[PDB]
Amino acid sequence: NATTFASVYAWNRKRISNCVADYSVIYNFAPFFAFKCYGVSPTKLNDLCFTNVYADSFVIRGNEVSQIAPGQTGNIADYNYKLPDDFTGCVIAWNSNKLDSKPSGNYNYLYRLLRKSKLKPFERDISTEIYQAGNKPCNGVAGPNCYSPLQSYGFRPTYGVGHQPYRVVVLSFELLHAPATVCGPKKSTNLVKNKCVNFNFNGLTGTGVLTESNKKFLPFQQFGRDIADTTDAVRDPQTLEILDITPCS
Amino acid sequence: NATTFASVYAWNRKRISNCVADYSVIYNFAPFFAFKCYGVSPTKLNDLCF
């Protein structure tokens, strides 16, 4: 619920940590134009945990929502905001013709039409230098061989659906097994020992027996995997003791 | 950039040859309700031949 987001070339990233992620507050909003998660299901975020989750905010001309996706190309994808091929998150985009658009023309958004090289994923280029397209050294002024690379939008409500300003929110979270802080509204039970019971520490479901071994985990280490990448040892999120996950009889 | 198109039963087919296929000029046109390609990706037309 922000009145104005940032520009595409100057997209702002919001760091989230020590949170209780209840994504039910987002579903009651207006029907989004594109709610697609590339690594998970949108109804399963409330039952999982995330190590580092970042929220990006930027507004495009609407029809360019297809460019905010892994493996896409275009003016926004190659110059302003690029997504990696291994992206794991959700993309949220909705219409904002009533907020970020004016009948006389809203000129508070740029998209860096021209750039010398293609931008790498998760980078920000807010340089306002004159794009030297010709051979003569541009002296910082507009000329026949160098123009302003930062072009303004013509957002007006008179344009049909597709040219209106669309606010895009990219939630980039890390689901790798690691010490995390955001672990939803999942509540806790007690700690039984030496019995075949289920375990759900940070979304890792399964069945095993806790033995409280003597493995020495480092502060940045919480999960341990065997040869077959099966998690056989975990660090309790609450208590600093180490517990092994051995299969039952 | 045409004022009027043809009929459905009399759909006109326009042959295109000996040109430079720059589909980037089509994006700044009127917003389309459905831009769906069935053989390639719409952002890959600027890298292939026909």
């Epitope: 009948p103 007006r156 409500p157 008179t158 344009y159 | 004022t3 009027t4």
Partner: nanobody, 121 residues
Framework: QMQLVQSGAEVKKPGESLKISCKGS????????IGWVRQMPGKGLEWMGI????????RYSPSFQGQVTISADKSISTAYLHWSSLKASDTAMYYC??????????????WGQGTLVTVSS
């Protein structure tokens, strides 16, 4: 009865703003494209642009993109033609036209009375 009435003659000087109008009545002023046509003394007709009363979809002439702006008021069914920084070559006869019940959308079957605009130092 359908008819287009325009404002009176406007005489100004170079470097002064001007906003003439042309009101249409007798028809539904929401679906008929309204445009303006320039006619210099002794020359032919020159089209500058058209507008849509429902939503302002302005299609300006390639020689009149930023040289002039066109607007309309749907509440009172009146179209406007705003100028900025007039020059000595802007003095000409300006008409307002609209599409008819038959033909293309830029046919301009109906016309106005015509507004005489003159500028001199």
């Amino acid at each position: 009865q359908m008819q287009l009435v325009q404002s009176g003659a406007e005489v100004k000087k170079p470097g002064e703003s001007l906003k003439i109008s042309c009101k249409g009545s007798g028809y539904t002023f929401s679906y008929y494209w309204i445009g303006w046509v320039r006619q210099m003394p002794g020359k032919g007709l020159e089209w500058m642009g058209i507008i849509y009363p429902g939503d302002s979809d302005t299609r300006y002439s390639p020689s009149f993109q930023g040289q002039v702006t066109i607007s309309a008021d749907k509440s009172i069914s009146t179209a406007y033609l705003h100028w900025s920084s007039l020059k000595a070559s802007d003095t000409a006869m300006y008409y307002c036209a609209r599409q008819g019940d038959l033909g293309d959308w830029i046919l301009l079957g109906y016309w106005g009375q015509g507004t005489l605009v003159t500028v001199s130092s």
